[PDB]
Amino acid sequence: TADLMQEWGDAVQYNPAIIKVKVEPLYELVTATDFAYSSTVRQNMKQAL
Amino acid sequence: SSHGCKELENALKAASGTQNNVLRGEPFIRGGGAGFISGLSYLELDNPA
């Protein structure tokens, strides 16, 4: 029923799924600001990944 | 005295029929409340408006 589709779409505001995603690989978080040997860890992550 | 009769009948019926019935629709909305969007975009086939 159109009513239940309305109710579903109302409730999606509060608990949505992720339809589209644009992602970066996690090594891009490895940053010298946080970690010694950042480059080395980064490269290791590339290889491991 | 002698008598002969031969009788022959052949009858043929062939019938055929087909239906193709295709229905398509794509209501599209931008803006407004997500529940109103989903409720209205849902295609009431009896009232496509």
Side-chain angles (χ1 to χ4, degrees):
Chain A
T1 307
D3 297 359
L4 301 179
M5 287 288 277
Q6 173 173 352
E7 287 191 297
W8 177 66
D10 176 79
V12 171
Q13 306 163 20
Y14 309 92
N15 186 23
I18 296 144
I19 308 316
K20 258 214 188 182
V21 82
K22 304 184 177 291
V23 298
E24 287 199 325
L26 205 65
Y27 64 70
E28 292 294 294
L29 300 177
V30 178
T31 55
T33 192
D34 299 312
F35 315 113
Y37 314 101
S38 68
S39 320
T40 87
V41 174
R42 204 193 148 265
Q43 196 57 240
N44 299 343
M45 286 187 153
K46 298 196 178 191
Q47 185 178 357
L49 181 57
Chain B
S1 182
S2 179
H3 165 280
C5 289
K6 309 194 67 178
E7 306 176 33
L8 166 158
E9 174 175 330
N10 188 318
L12 166 62
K13 179 177 178 179
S16 286
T18 75
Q19 305 184 23
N20 294 283
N21 180 342
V22 178
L23 189 158
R24 303 188 189 213
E26 302 82 0
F28 181 94
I29 305 170
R30 292 180 67 250
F36 306 105
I37 303 174
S38 58
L40 185 60
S41 73
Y42 183 69
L43 193 66
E44 299 213 315
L45 279 146
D46 60 311
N47 192 5

